A paper describes a structure:
Structurally, HDAC6 is a zinc-dependent metallohydrolase with an atypical complex domain organization that interacts predominantly with cytosolic substrates, including tubulin, cortactin, and peroxiredoxins. The catalytic activity of HDAC6 toward acetylated substrates has been studied both experimentally and computationally. Zinc-dependent histone deacetylases (HDACs) play critical roles in numerous (patho)physiological processes through the deacylation of lysine residues of their substrate proteins. Herein, we report on the synthesis and biochemical, crystallographic, and computational characterization of a series of oxadiazole-based inhibitors selectively targeting the HDAC6 isoform. Surprisingly, but in line with a very recent finding reported in the literature, a crystal structure of the HDAC6/inhibitor complex revealed that hydrolysis of the oxadiazole ring transforms the parent oxadiazole into an acylhydrazide through a sequence of two hydrolytic steps.
To elucidate the binding mode of inhibitor 8 in the HDAC6 active site, we co-crystallized 8 with the catalytic DD2 domain of the wild-type zebrafish orthologue (zHDAC6; amino acids 440–798). The crystal structure of the zHDAC6/inhibitor complex was solved by molecular replacement to the resolution limit of 1.35 Å. Surprisingly, the Fo–Fc electron density peaks in the vicinity of the active-site zinc ion revealed that the oxadiazole ring of the parent compound 8 had been hydrolyzed into a hydrazide reaction product (4, identified later). Once we had confirmed the chemical nature of the product by liquid chromatography–mass spectrometry (LC–MS)/MS, it was modeled into well-resolved Fo–Fc positive electron density peaks in the later stages of the refinement. The hydrazide group of 4 coordinates the active-site Zn2+ ion in a bidentate fashion, with an interatomic distance of 2.6 and 2.1 Å between the Zn2+ ion and the C=O and the terminal NH2 group of the hydrazide, respectively. Furthermore, the C=O group accepts a hydrogen bond from the hydroxyl group of Y745 (2.6 Å), and the N–N group forms hydrogen bonds with the imidazole ring present in the side chains of H573 (2.9 Å) and H574 (2.7 Å). The chlorophenyl moiety of the cap group of the inhibitor is positioned within van der Waals distances from the side chains of H463, F583, P464, and L712 (modeled in two conformations) of the L1-loop pocket. One of the more notable features here is the T-shaped π–π stacking interaction between the chlorophenyl group and the side chain of F583 at a distance of 5.1 Å between the aromatic ring centers. At the same time, the methylsulfonyl group is solvent exposed and does not contribute to interactions with the enzyme. The pyridine ring present in the linker engages in parallel π–π stacking with side chains of F583 and F643 lining the entrance tunnel, with distances of 4.0 and 4.2 Å between the respective aromatic residues.
Author numbering: 442 to 769, 774 to 798
The structure:
């Protein structure tokens, strides 16, 4: 009945040498870690060590070409780092980037291992750079390797190929990389909530719309919950969980839950423009704890208001530790989004009928 926590200060070394105010800051993870100490959560957790992912583990989801290219950045001069980062959509690279990406992934593997071997019930991973925009063959959106997708495959690699893994992605952006990696896969249920604005919101693709339900044997196993029409918050996230996330998850019956836990839908976030509260994130966490016999790993993705992400992620950890949850009308367009997803998924999930 133990909660694991992984954090390693070495993941601060990845930085933007041309713009020190770029919002994907080293101090995102140190601020979150400090808040856990201040709230006396850290001493309640079992500390899981970080490690490097191996290149073989990266190949669970990424091409050997992509791995090779990111690894080559380790010894590049600034000019070539700039050139390489510019080949991608919204990437900056320093000499430390590759090692940090490997540590973020390795940290999550050790956390998944700790859960699946019964050393801990659940776990939190305070890691950067983030993962969910990274594709098999490319980096994107501050992400180099898809930490959460790699973690699902790593979990399968130590149990069975068909281990049922639910990934709930509540980062305010669509995890395009996670969707694509698992698009034909019925072993990994991908559920994302995200601001969409008919394609105006990053990463600017119709791949994030509610009608993208999965392909082939994966049909029904990709659930996109897209928001349009500006600010959303706790009422809309709670309704999406009540009507969609939780009934689908219960029918899937996952054996492991991974949360692509960006905190950029948080009140105060400059990039997300949403109003989800720390108490909101705590309730979402508590709901997910009802799945998979409590086997939940919370993985940091985005989230840029240092105070907001520190309070919100700490409240999720408080829930994992078994603390009592909070006791908390929708925007019109949110009702429209939820009903669109319900209609898209009723052919696949009896619970929605
Ligand atoms: C071009 S942009 O959209 O303004 N954008 C891309 C972006 C935004 C958010 C995320 C994210 O949080 N993903 N989870 C990833 N990439 C961006 C790029 C560089 C700097 C800033 Cl402030 C914003
Ligand atoms: K998301
Ligand atoms: K899938
Ligand atoms: Zn995000």
């Amino acid at each position: 009945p133990i909660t694991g926590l992984v954090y390693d200060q070495r993941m601060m070394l990845h930085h933007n040498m041309w713009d020190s105010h770029h919002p994907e800051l080293p101090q995102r993870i140190s601020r979150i870690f400090s808040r856990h100490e201040e709230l006396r959560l850290l001493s309640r957790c079992h500390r899981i060590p970080a490690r490097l992912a191996t290149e073989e583990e990266l190949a669970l989801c990424h091409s050997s070409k992509h791995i090779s290219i990111i690894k080559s950045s380790e010894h590049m001069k600034p000019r070539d780092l700039n050139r390489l980062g510019d080949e991608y959509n919204s990437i900056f690279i320093s000499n430390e980037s590759y090692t940090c990406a490997l540590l973020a992934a390795g940290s999550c593997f050790n956390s998944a291992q700790a859960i699946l071997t019964g050393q801990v019930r659940n776990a939190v991973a305070i890691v950067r750079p983030p993962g969910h925009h990274a594709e098999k063959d490319t980096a994107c959106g501050f992400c180099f390797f898809n930490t959460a997708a790699l973690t699902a495959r790593y979990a399968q690699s130590i149990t069975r190929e068909s281990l049922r893994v639910l990934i709930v992605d509540w980062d305010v952006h669509h995890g395009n990389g996670t969707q694509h990696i698992f698009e034909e896969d019925d072993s990994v249920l991908y559920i994302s909530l995200h601001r969409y604005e008919d394609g105006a919101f990053f990463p600017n693709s119709e791949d994030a719309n509610y009608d993208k339900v999965g392909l082939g044997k994966g049909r029904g196993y990709n659930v996109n919950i897209p928001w349009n029409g500006g600010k959303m918050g706790d009422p809309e996230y709670m309704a999406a969980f009540h009507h969609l996330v939780m009934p689908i998850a219960r029918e899937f019956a996952p054996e492991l839950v991974l949360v692509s836990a960006g905190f950029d839908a948080a009140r105060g976030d400059p990039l997300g423009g949403f109003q989800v509260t720390p108490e909101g994130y705590a309730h979402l966490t508590h709901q997910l704890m009802s799945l998979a016999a409590g086997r939940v790993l919370i993985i940091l993705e985005g989230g840029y208001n240092l105070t907001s992400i520190s309070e919100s992620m700490s409240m999720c950890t408080s829930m994992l530790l078994g603390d009592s949850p909070p006791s908390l009308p929708l925007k019109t367009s949110a009702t429209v989004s939820i009903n669109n997803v319900l209609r898209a998924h009723a052919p696949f999930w009896s619970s929605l009928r």
